């Protein structure tokens, strides 16, 4: 499997004075850190969230983000006066890395404005997107004359991020590999027509996210099976609904069959 580390930031400016910035981090499907506007430190949600970092350097990292939050809102405000922009402002950042044993590690750092991409970090500098507006270029060449942030930014993606992901795969080796088995059941929901009934098959409580559910006529794979989204439970497990629109005669004697990585070879089947 793949366990990349994504760090996501949600900065929102409403008017001249009101603004909040919140963040969090993910490793695979699992969320390992939470960072709140009300808080003054990044919170760690797992006993292994610190990786193999010493306490002294986890704190200097805490310090770097602390100054980052203040300066970011200061810099973003000043851009809004400089280039004449209105104040419902929504910035999002999505950075991180992915360690590959085969020596081809990925670095990215993406910024978005009102839900549209505007610029990223590529080699040693920030670069706008083709679709971005023209004012973006005025901001981009003042950002690039901050040699320190550019130099620092380079150290986190190239250097500290791969060390972190490797530390976290060590510490959390047991929770990442865990396996929880789902349970299934059947009800009856929205009926399409008067003669057409809609049979539902719910499966709830599986940890490794990939899953496979499908209705069948015993063992003849039907195509009338249409599954929904994979929705989270508060458990850090998952839930998925599965539907099948058929008439009442073509309804006796079908099955809902589910296959998941945690059930070893056997598969839960539920008939009617």
């Amino acid at each position: 499997r793949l366990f990349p580390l994504r760090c996501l930031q949600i900065s929102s400016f409403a008017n001249s004075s009101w603004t909040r910035t919140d963040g969090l981090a993910w490793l695979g499907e699992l969320q390992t850190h939470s960072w709140s506007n009300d808080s003054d430190t990044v919170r760690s949600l797992k006993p292994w969230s610190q990786g193999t970092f010493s306490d002294q350097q986890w704190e200097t990292l805490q310090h770097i983000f602390r100054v980052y939050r203040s300066s970011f809102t200061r810099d973003v405000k000043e851009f809004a006066k400089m280039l004449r922009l209105s104040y419902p402002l929504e910035l999002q950042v999505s950075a991180g890395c992915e360690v590959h044993p085969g020596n081809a590690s990925n670095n990215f750092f993406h910024v978005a404005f009102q839900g549209k991409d505007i610029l990223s970090f590529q080699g040693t500098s920030w670069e706008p997107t083709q679709e971005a507006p023209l004012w973006v270029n005025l901001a981009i060449q003042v950002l690039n004359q901050d040699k320190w942030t550019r130099e620092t930014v380079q150290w986190l993606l190239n250097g500290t991020c791969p060390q972190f992901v490797s530390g976290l795969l060590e510490s959390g080796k047991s929770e990442l590999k865990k396996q929880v088995k789902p349970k299934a059941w059947l009800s009856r929901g929205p009926s399409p027509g008067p003669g057409r009934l809609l049979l539902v098959c719910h499966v709830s409580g599986f940890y490794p996210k990939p899953v496979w559910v499908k209705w069948m006529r015993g063992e003849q794979e039907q195509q009338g099976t249409q599954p929904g989204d994979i929705l989270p439970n508060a458990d850090e497990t998952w839930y998925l609904r599965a539907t099948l629109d058929v008439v009442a005669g073509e309804a006796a004697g079908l099955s809902c069959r589910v296959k998941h990585s945690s059930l070893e070879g056997q598969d839960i089947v539920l008939y009617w």
Partner: T-cell receptor, first 111, second 112 residues
Framework: AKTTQPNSMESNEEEPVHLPCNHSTISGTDYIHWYRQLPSQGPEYVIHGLTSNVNNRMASLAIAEDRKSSTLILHRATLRDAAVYYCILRDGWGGTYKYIFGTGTRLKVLA | GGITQSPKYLFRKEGQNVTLSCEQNLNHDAMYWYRQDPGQGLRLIYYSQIVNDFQKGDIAEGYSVSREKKESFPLTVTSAQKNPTAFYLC???????????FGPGTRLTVTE
């Protein structure tokens, strides 16, 4: 968190030179610096890198992929480039500030 | 300018000892005191991350420094040292990627 270099090295003028450095115990957050010092003066920064190869006007840095060794390349050496060359590790966190130099490689440039 | 050690040459006699300069043009928090003998590497006397703050090196024995200000870091040698005659060099550091800069250096021979 130290490095190892040859003690001596000789090279003929108007040619590129390859000066090696070893550091088997390097970490992902350590920079690599090179400094040189001429006989009666004080040293001077030459180049530095972290994870990619680096190119300047006079010299380039070449990192091995396993990061346990590297190389400082002088593109064209003249008599004036005779000096002592120091290979140094620097912690990217900036924790311990015992910034200590090793013993270096002494380059001799023949005519 | 950068760093200015002065003067180039300095002599004195044993017991008639000295304190020595190192003055800083730009603005940097950290300063270092190195020390070199003929054909030998650079050894560290004292380092200082910010004013009112020092840390001893490995040849700090028989020296003493002070940082009242960020623009000055004097070196006194009167503390009886083994070989007070050598080449003294003063350095300075910036933030990440933490590069180092040196002055022109001062040479002091003291007649034994």
């Amino acid at each position: 968190a130290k490095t190892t270099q040859p003690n001596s090295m000789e090279s003929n003028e108007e040619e590129p030179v390859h000066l090696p450095c070893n550091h088997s115990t390097i970490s992902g957050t350590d920079y690599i610096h090179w400094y040189r010092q001429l006989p009666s003066q004080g040293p001077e920064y030459v180049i530095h890198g972290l994870t990619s190869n680096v190119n300047n006007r006079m010299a380039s840095l070449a990192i091995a992929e396993d990061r346990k060794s590297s190389t400082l390349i002088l593109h064209r050496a003249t008599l004036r480039d005779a000096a002592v060359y120091y290979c140094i590790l620097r912690d990217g966190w900036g924790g311990t500030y015992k910034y200590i130099f090793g013993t270096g490689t002494r380059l001799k440039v023949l005519a | 300018g950068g760093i200015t050690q002065s003067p180039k040459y300095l002599f004195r006699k044993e017991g008639q000892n000295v304190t020595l300069s190192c003055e800083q043009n730009l603005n940097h928090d950290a300063m270092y005191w190195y020390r070199q003998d003929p054909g030998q590497g650079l050894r560290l006397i004292y380092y200082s991350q910010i004013v009112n703050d020092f840390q001893k090196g490995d040849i700090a024995e028989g020296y003493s420094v002070s940082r009242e200000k960020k623009e000055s870091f004097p070196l006194t040698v009167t503390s009886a040292q083994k070989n007070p005659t050598a080449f003294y060099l003063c350095a300075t550091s910036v933030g990440r990627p933490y590069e180092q800069y040196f002055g022109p250096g001062t040479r002091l021979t003291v007649t034994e």
